[PDB]
Amino acid sequence: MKPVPTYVQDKDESTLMFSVCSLVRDQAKYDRLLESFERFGFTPDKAEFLAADNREGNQFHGFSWHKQMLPRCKGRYVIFCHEDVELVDRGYDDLVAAIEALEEADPKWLVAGVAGSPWRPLNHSVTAQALHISDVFGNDRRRGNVPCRVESLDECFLLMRRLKPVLNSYDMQGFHYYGADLCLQAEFLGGRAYAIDFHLHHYGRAIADENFHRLRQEMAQKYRRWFPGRILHCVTGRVALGGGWYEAR
């Protein structure tokens, strides 16, 4: 029998605007997320919801989960978020408007999020931040001015085009620094990361535990190879990558 091939054209055949993917451990938190997204406009004609299932253990981690989720997504844009975000005022139409405005402003974007660190800060004496969020540090708070280009994004809420993805590294594992890693890989691929203005409530918070310190060192050891001397800002703090001339004392 002659094979029957499928001929593929360059066309966006999505009908859903969003695939909302979440890293899920706690059913109650995820149910709260799902109810809030539906309340704020992510109805079944607009969005589908997928969960990386970490309810029984750490099946997935921050650097691996997109590779299993992406193939299952059918939406134009793929959100990767934590289970402890919830929509509270801004909704579906606001996110679509922010993304479409970003496409007009800078078509080289590849990843967008709600909180991060401005790209190449001049002032390394303080940690640069650009965000608009409600979180444990305050309701309806801001740092910097969003939208803006960033060098890192907080992991709580990220998005990419399904047809223009970015991948996390294979040589790191765990639950820290996968937002920065994604933004650095986007730069290697020739694109950009932005923090957009899309206010939501994030009720989780950072754990500066041994894995955080381990992954901070692994990120420096990895990325100093290619970014010698750079000081990378994240909302969790600056990381002096070292390498090259910077190793002189």
Place this chain on the structure above:
Amino acid sequence: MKPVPTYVQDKDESTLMFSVCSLVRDQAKYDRLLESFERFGFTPDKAEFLAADNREGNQFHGFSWHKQMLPRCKGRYVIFCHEDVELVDRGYDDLVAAIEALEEADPKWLVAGVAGSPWRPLNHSVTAQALHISDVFGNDRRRGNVPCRVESLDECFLLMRRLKPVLNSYDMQGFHYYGADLCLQAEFLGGRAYAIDFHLHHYGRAIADENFHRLRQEMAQKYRRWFPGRILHCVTGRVALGGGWYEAR
């Protein structure tokens, strides 16, 4: 209405071994490819065939096509090949055996192909090559010793796991150097590229094309940023990337 999410486990749910994707412009060459893969064991229980359709125009190019093809693939391994390869002796079982052997030998592999340049050659006075193929330069010919780790692969045939992909750059376009670009991105992602021993026939001759020289220069301009001084070998020739200390005269 409460959203109904899909819970995703870390399981390989493929039933097809291969998705064979080809960049197609000439129907007669592609029909010959399809006949040869079926004859050599890529039957519909084992493989599906998809074509990035360039029959009417340059709809896709070498850096863009995988991003539209990958979402449509259901196989465990995705082959990205040219329309002018054909199987002539080695077949489905041989390719499976070679891939499974590579997984045992070096689980850090991310991309495999049939022809490329050994990783970090010591001898930059000649172009390093590692291949086994029949092509315009000879039937059943070899360079070097395959399988082996490479820093670049020829574009005529390469493959990745569907669940552990690598992406080509967004900031280059055209029909040269997308094999080397994929291998360099694999290294940024923490993995490796290999030339395996899987003999096929790659017919046709390269034609003079100003875009080859254009993309050689763009590749040097891009990658010298992160690989200063490196001499990158491809089967098409060495490229001294320049940059850094190497710019001293």
